Amino acid sequence: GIGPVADLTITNAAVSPDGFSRQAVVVNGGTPGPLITGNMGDRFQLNVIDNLTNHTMLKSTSIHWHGFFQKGTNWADGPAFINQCPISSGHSFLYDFQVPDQAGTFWYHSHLSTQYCDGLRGPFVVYDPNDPAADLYDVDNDDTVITLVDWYHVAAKLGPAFPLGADATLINGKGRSPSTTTADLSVISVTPGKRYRFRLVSLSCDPNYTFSIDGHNMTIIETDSINTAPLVVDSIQIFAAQRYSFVLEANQAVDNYWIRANPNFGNVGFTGGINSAILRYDGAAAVEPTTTQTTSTAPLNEVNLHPLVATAVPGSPVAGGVDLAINMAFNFNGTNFFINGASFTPPTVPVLLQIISGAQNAQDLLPSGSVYSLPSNADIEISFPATAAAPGAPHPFHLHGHAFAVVRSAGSTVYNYDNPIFRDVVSTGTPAAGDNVTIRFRTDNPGPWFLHCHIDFHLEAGFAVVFAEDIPDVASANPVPQAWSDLCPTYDARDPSDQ
Numbered sequence: 001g002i003g004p005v006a007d008l009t010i011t012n013a014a015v016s017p018d019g020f021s022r023q024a025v026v027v028n029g030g031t032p033g034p035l036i037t038g039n040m041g042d043r044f045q046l047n048v049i050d051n052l053t054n055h056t057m058l059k060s061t062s063i064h065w066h067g068f069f070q071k072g073t074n075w076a077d078g079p080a081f082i083n084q085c086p087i088s089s090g091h092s093f094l095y096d097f098q099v100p101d102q103a104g105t106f107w108y109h110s111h112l113s114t115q116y117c118d119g120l121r122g123p124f125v126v127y128d129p130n131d132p133a134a135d136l137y138d139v140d141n142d143d144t145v146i147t148l149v150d151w152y153h154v155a156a157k158l159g160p161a162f163p164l165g166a167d168a169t170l171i172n173g174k175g176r177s178p179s180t181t182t183a184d185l186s187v188i189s190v191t192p193g194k195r196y197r198f199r200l201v202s203l204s205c206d207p208n209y210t211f212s213i214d215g216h217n218m219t220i221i222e223t224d225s226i227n228t229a230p231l232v233v234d235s236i237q238i239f240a241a242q243r244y245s246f247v248l249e250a251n252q253a254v255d256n257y258w259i260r261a262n263p264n265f266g267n268v269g270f271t272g273g274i275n276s277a278i279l280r281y282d283g284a285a286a287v288e289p290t291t292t293q294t295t296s297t298a299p300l301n302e303v304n305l306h307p308l309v310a311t312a313v314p315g316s317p318v319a320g321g322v323d324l325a326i327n328m329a330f331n332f333n334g335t336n337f338f339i340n341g342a343s344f345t346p347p348t349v350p351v352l353l354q355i356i357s358g359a360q361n362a363q364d365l366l367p368s369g370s371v372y373s374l375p376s377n378a379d380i381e382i383s384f385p386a387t388a389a390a391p392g393a394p395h396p397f398h399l400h401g402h403a404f405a406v407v408r409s410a411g412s413t414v415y416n417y418d419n420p421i422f423r424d425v426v427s428t429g430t431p432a433a434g435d436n437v438t439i440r441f442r443t444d445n446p447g448p449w450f451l452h453c454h455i456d457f458h459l460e461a462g463f464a465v466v467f468a469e470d471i472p473d474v475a476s477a478n479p480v481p482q483a484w485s486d487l488c489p490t491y492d493a494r495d496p497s498d499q
């Protein structure tokens with residue numbers, strides 16, 4: 001892939017991953033952006049060159065590196081109006097951060113409005129030179145990365161506020177729509193007897209996917225960048241922005257096998273080969289598979305996921321047994337989402353800048369009602385009670401700057417204070433199951449961090465909140481480069497359309 005130091009030139013271009021031509025936001029020439037890679041400990045210097053020209057998809061841009069804690073570099077997190085002002089067309093900005101005690105599968109994508117739905121998204125992998133699970137597989141490179149994308153024929157700002165289905169699922173950049181069943185599919189090669197570490201990443205904007213491979217099992221060894229105890233699975237339900245590394249042994253008869261990624265809504269099923277890709281054993285003919293899907297008897301269940309290494313759940317083994325506990329009461333009034341009676345709306349001055357400029361607490365920070373103060377070095381517990389007042393469930397919630405422990409998973413009434421996995425994106429389940437997904441984390445990273453549903457269309461509608469973590473240490477902990485301090489002046493000078 002493209003080493004720790006690289007340029008990411010953003011432009012507009014007509015594209016047709018599913019056979020349908022449409023203008024989009026492209027990175028270095030392609031929508032599923034280029035795979036970015038590096039090793040644990042590597043310093044990353046990703047220069048984002050904004051050469052966009054299309055206002056309707058927004059000439060401005062900002063990029064978030066999903067999963068990375070960005071400790072000491074809160075200004076490079078990406079969230080527009082949270083940690084920075086957007087980059088302006090004709091300008092470039094350098095994201096320069098280090099990745100220390102982190103290694104696994106991630107991705108990058110615009111964090112400006114719904115722009116990542118229009119194409120600014122790509123996979124990001126950080127290898128571990130001494131990976132604990134290295135002995136469990138033979139191949140792990142550019143070809144074992146699998147990306148899932150919900151592709152729309154209509155641009156994000158031109159279609160419905162809430163699409164309710166993508167025209168086609170893209171696996172590794174390719175796929176078919178009910179109207180383009182002869183479009184080329186992605187092919188993933190495996191050689192007999194070899195074990196592969198496949199890195200499954202959802203770059204989705206709304207759909208969650210039920211992923212499976214005909215005739216093959218899958219051993220999960222990673223969830224959202226956290227090393228996981230090996231778990232043999234039949235199928236994987238992956239929500240927006242989640243990731244899973246699973247080992248697959250090419251131990252079946254040399255042949256072509258269907259790789260399925262069935263979305264929860266939109267064009268479901270596999271008629272005409274949609275929502276599909278191809279697993280091709282060396283020696284197999286270049287033809288479509290004809291293998292049949294069988295019933296899943298070992299579905300992945302988050303509750304069955306455990307950290308590879310013993311990792312203590314912050315706080316105490318009791319409900320609320322924590323320093324600060326917060327419940328997120330979800331709501332919707334039609335066009336907009338709410339969290340604790342507030343509907344997020346981007347402030348003009350980015351929250352990081354507000355704090356650097358003197359912001360002393362939650363009351364000062366804007367927008368009002370969407371910011372929470374978090375004391376440093378403390379245990380936090382948050383609950384997301386599924387309420388039908390919030391349509392669109394299951395809502396995958398995401399926390400920036402930290403990995404959290406899922407003490408209670410969707411579709412379960414258990415509270416695990418001893419063995420829960422840690423991850424950064426979690427499904428908050430749904431209301432007939434009486435779900436009440438609950439997570440915990442320790443405030444070990446000073447700075448303002450976003451917390452929101454990763455269904456971009458819901459984020460755009462205000463389904464978000466901001467955590468102002470340890471406000472006093474914020475400015476000192478996150479020194480900002482000149483280029484960052486210039487972002488806002490150059491962005492605010494732009495005319496509404498001359499974006």
Ligand SMILES: Cc1ccc(C)c(N)c1
Pocket residue numbers: 162164206265391392455457
């Ligand atoms: C409001 C609303 C209704 C239905 C779905 C599937 C989403 N995402 C959002």
Ligand SMILES: [Cu+2]
Pocket residue numbers: 064065066067398399400401
């Ligand atoms: Cu993130």
Ligand SMILES: [Cu+2]
Pocket residue numbers: 064066241398454
């Ligand atoms: Cu994200």
Ligand SMILES: [Cu+2]
Pocket residue numbers: 392394395396453454455458463
């Ligand atoms: Cu949502």
Ligand SMILES: [Cu+2]
Pocket residue numbers: 064111398400450452
């Ligand atoms: Cu985010």
